[PDB]
Amino acid sequence: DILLTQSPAILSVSPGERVSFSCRASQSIGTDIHWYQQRTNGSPRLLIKYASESISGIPSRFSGSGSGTDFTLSINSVESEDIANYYCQQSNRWPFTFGSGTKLEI
Amino acid sequence: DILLTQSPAILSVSPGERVSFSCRASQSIGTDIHWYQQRTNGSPRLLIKYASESISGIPSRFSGSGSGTDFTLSINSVESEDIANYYCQQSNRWPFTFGSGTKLEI
Amino acid sequence: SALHWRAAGAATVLLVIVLLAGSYLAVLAERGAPGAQLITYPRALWWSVETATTVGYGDLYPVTLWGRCVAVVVMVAGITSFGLVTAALATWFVGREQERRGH
Amino acid sequence: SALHWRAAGAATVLLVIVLLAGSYLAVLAERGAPGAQLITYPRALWWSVETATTVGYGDLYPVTLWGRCVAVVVMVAGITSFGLVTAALATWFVGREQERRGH
Amino acid sequence: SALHWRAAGAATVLLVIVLLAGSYLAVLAERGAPGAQLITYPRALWWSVETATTVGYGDLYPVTLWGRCVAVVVMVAGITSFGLVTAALATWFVGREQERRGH
Amino acid sequence: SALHWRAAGAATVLLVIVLLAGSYLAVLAERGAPGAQLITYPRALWWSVETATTVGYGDLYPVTLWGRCVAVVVMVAGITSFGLVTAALATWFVGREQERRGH
Ligand SMILES: CCCCCCCCCCCC(=O)OC[C@H](CO)OC(=O)CCCCCCCC
Ligand SMILES: CCCCCCCCCCCC(=O)OC[C@H](CO)OC(=O)CCCCCCCC
Ligand SMILES: CCCCCCCCCCCC(=O)OC[C@H](CO)OC(=O)CCCCCCCC
Ligand SMILES: CCCCCCCCCCCC(=O)OC[C@H](CO)OC(=O)CCCCCCCC
Ligand SMILES: CCCC[N+](CCCC)(CCCC)CCCC
Ligand SMILES: CCCCCCCCCO
Ligand SMILES: CCCCCCCCCO
Ligand SMILES: CCCCCCCCCO
Ligand SMILES: CCCCCCCCCO
Ligand SMILES: CCCCCCC
Ligand SMILES: CCCCCCC
Ligand SMILES: CCCCCCC
Ligand SMILES: CCCCCCC
Ligand SMILES: [Co+2]
Ligand SMILES: [K+]
Ligand SMILES: [K+]
Ligand SMILES: [K+]
Ligand SMILES: [K+]
Ligand SMILES: [K+]
Ligand SMILES: [K+]
């Protein structure tokens, strides 16, 4: 199965700063990576699909970039409601797999 | 030739525990990996074919998973008759090659 | 009207249906096979087009028994249908040449 | 003159135009997609040739929706045009055999 | 009955036999070549199908002299046979158009 | 004798000559390009066969301008020649059906 590594596991940042979450795939997967936000006690919520595509309802703050094996979720100007766990997910090859998670800390 | 690495060489486990044997191929081989059990003084016996397919007569205890380069033989709830040497074998590319073996210890 | 053009039209509709059903069935066949890439609908439709035209880039392909049977039906239908267009054009040209000759 | 040869000539000119416009539009469609290789004009012309003839080596291929629509037009036009040449040859051979028979 | 349909039927049976013998002989030819992937029977049958239809994904291919000779026979037979179907369809359409004209 | 069979024979000889000259010229064109794999004669002949039949596995392909021009000539000649065989078969079937009808 495709291994998705997310390191660092925790990310500390000051309010209004730009933050970047990393996702690395164990093999090349074009742009078939999707990003989810999960707040404390909430269900996951899709933020970005196919590595860079916006979802409606998601703040413009959030963007994605990357292809092949290296992927980045970015937040321009972090704020409090962004405190969450962040997961990447691949749909290039069966079975779909998740990364292990990066926690965002302010 | 395709190199098949099986590490650890020996695996110690307590009865009824879940055990996982590892097989890594030096290049990508889809699912063309087969697993054999060889008890002391016995001939090898096929357990799993094409990485995850059951053989009839093998206890349901045994399963396989993986594709590409990383393969796993698993035993739910180890028991005494499982004390053996365990070998993987590839048929993706000529010539067929064997891994070096993992011994199971209880 | 003329049989050759009826058959061409019919060939084209059938091929569209084979593409669409092939996409749906390839995903069905291929999910559950570790390593399979032919597993989402939009790229499956692309894959079936490039298979019917027999272009086959190698960016996508089935790895299961049923996925591969699906693939064969798609090939045979793309080759057959395009062959039928060529046949219909040859009928058209032959009939017009008989005329131009006064036959 | 004869319809089959007119159509062959016309098929060939159309195909050349499809190759050229396909190259230009494939680059247009594909730039802005991370990972896309089909992004400079000279290799795009090569890519469209190997797609029209349906050879498809897999050294290059579109990854976007529009790039792939472009690809489909190119395939259909290469297959169609070469089919039309075969049709025109069959008309030629059939007419000459009618003669050789005295019909 | 009619020659074109007899030949089509015959083409199809021959092609099935070429696929099967090609699979068996490709494995024979290719085992003993380090690195060869065309070495088990089920994927060899798939490989020969995708070669006969000329789809050629590139997931499998021979690397030896004899494997490649085998491959050539399979190509020629798939192209030839499918060509023969097109020919038979053109004969069918031409005959029906002669009728519809009253000729 | 009959034009269609003469042309088929001639098509086959021409194609053999194009394969052989294409192999020789592809190596010539491609040596001196860093990364090129199409650089020894035996695999070049194989490469040209799989290009003429339009199978194109992707194990080998030109990367230079002239290598790619060479490739195009080979494609056009393989497609054309095999098309000519189909044409000749359609002429054969059509003539035999005229007979079987008493025309
Ligand atoms: C069995 C049901 C089949 C349904 C398939 C429908 C797909 C078509 C449009 C949907 C829009 C979309 O979001 O896909 C484009 C995608 C953008 O992310 O990129 C893609 O590459 C899609 C490739 C599809 C290419 C098909 C070309 C065939 C002429
Ligand atoms: C929409 C506009 C299309 C314009 C394309 C024109 C390209 C042709 C000649 C330019 C010379 C050049 O510097 O290219 C050769 C290049 C050398 O660096 O190597 C290449 O590989 C170019 C490959 C092109 C192969 C095309 C073969 C088709 C018969
Ligand atoms: C010269 C003798 C040829 C014998 C070949 C017979 C193979 C067919 C069925 C056997 C079942 C099996 O276990 O194969 C399917 C396999 C499942 O492990 O996956 C596969 O991918 C097999 C691929 C075969 C695809 C062929 C499609 C052609 C229409
Ligand atoms: C322009 C001159 C062309 C000359 C080419 C002649 C090659 C043919 C025979 C020589 C024997 C040899 O040592 O090649 C086989 C090789 C064994 O090492 O393996 C190979 O893979 C050679 C592949 C050639 C496949 C061609 C199949 C076409 C029907
Ligand atoms: C330019 C396209 C021609 C490709 N054909 C037919 C197209 C199929 C949609 C492949 C048929 C082979 C089964 C002709 C063979 C070329 C040698
Ligand atoms: C031979 C083509 C029919 C499709 C075979 C089964 C479809 C997928 C089953 O899961
Ligand atoms: C269907 C072929 C027409 C091309 C589609 C759009 C061209 C590229 C747009 O950016
Ligand atoms: C030319 C096709 C006939 C097959 C050549 C030999 C078969 C494999 C020999 O080991
Ligand atoms: C267009 C085909 C003719 C070949 C072009 C030149 C041959 C290689 C030159 O080095
Ligand atoms: C079981 C019906 C077959 C579907 C057509 C395959 C494309
Ligand atoms: C919008 C016009 C289509 C261009 C032809 C595609 C090759
Ligand atoms: C020696 C007989 C040739 C077998 C047919 C090749 C597919
Ligand atoms: C300059 C002569 C062209 C050779 C034929 C290409 C295969
Ligand atoms: Co008459
Ligand atoms: K390839
Ligand atoms: K490849
Ligand atoms: K082809
Ligand atoms: K092809
Ligand atoms: K191909
Ligand atoms: K390919």
From Swiss-Prot, chains C, D, E, F:
UniProt family annotation: Belongs to the potassium channel family.
Keyword Transmembrane appears in the UniProt entry = yes
Q: What happens when the gene is disrupted?
A: Cells grow slower and to lower myceliar densities.
Q: Which residue ranges does UniProt annotate as crossing the membrane?
A: 7-29, 67-90
Question: What is a GO molecular function of this protein?
Answer: identical protein binding
- Superkingdom classification of source: Bacteria
Q: What is its main location?
A: membrane
Task: Name its species.
Answer: Streptomyces lividans
Function per UniProt? Acts as a pH-gated potassium ion channel; changing the cytosolic pH from 7 to 4 opens the channel, although it is not clear if this is the physiological stimulus for channel opening. Monovalent cation preference is K(+) > Rb(+) > NH4(+) >> Na(+) > Li(+).
**Name of this chain's protein:** pH-gated potassium channel KcsA
What fragment of the whole protein does this chain represent? 22 to 124 of 160
